[PDB]
Design a protein around this ligand. Structure first.
Ligand SMILES: [Zn+2]
Ligand SMILES: [Zn+2]
Ligand SMILES: [Zn+2]
Ligand SMILES: [Zn+2]
Ligand SMILES: [Zn+2]
Ligand SMILES: [Zn+2]
Length: 96
DNA sequence: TTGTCTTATCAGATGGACTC
DNA sequence: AAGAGTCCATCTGATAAGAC
């Protein structure tokens, strides 16, 4: 399971990375990027989903999932119901 | 195999809750 | 009581995986 190399936290609203590529929680990531030293120690309007790694907002200011949000940004039309994928997907993102 | 397309997952911006 | 400095969830934007 993904662990922050600084504090050891396994839960966080947004995983970030250091220069070498290793993982930091949101709090450790912002601190080290800001300061340059280690840190001391709801559903979608469109598709009605309740599971997403990143919530976004539509023009009116309502919450939409990552997929629905990024889709409208690229189509100027809401994400159709017939595109909704089952379960969760993950990707091996490389560093650099 | 090639390119297109969707959208995970990274990074930066913002703003409210906090401390000095 | 008013301001600047600090913290960090939550937002927007960039990059790019990986299925089609
Ligand atoms: Zn951490
Ligand atoms: Zn490292
Ligand atoms: Zn959605
Ligand atoms: Zn399309
Ligand atoms: Zn600010
Ligand atoms: Zn690829």
């Amino acid at each position: 399971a993904r662990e922050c190399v600084n504090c050891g936290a396994t839960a966080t609203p947004l995983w970030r990375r250091d220069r070498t590529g290793h993982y930091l929680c949101n709090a450790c990531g912002l601190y080290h990027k800001m300061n340059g030293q280690n840190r001391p120690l709801t559903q979608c309007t469109n598709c009605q989903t309740t599971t997403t790694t990143l919530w976004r907002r539509n023009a009116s200011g309502d919450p939409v999932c990552n997929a629905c949000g990024l889709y409208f940004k690229l189509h100027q039309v809401n994400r159709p119901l017939t595109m909704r994928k089952d379960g969760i997907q993950t990707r091996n993102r490389k560093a650099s």
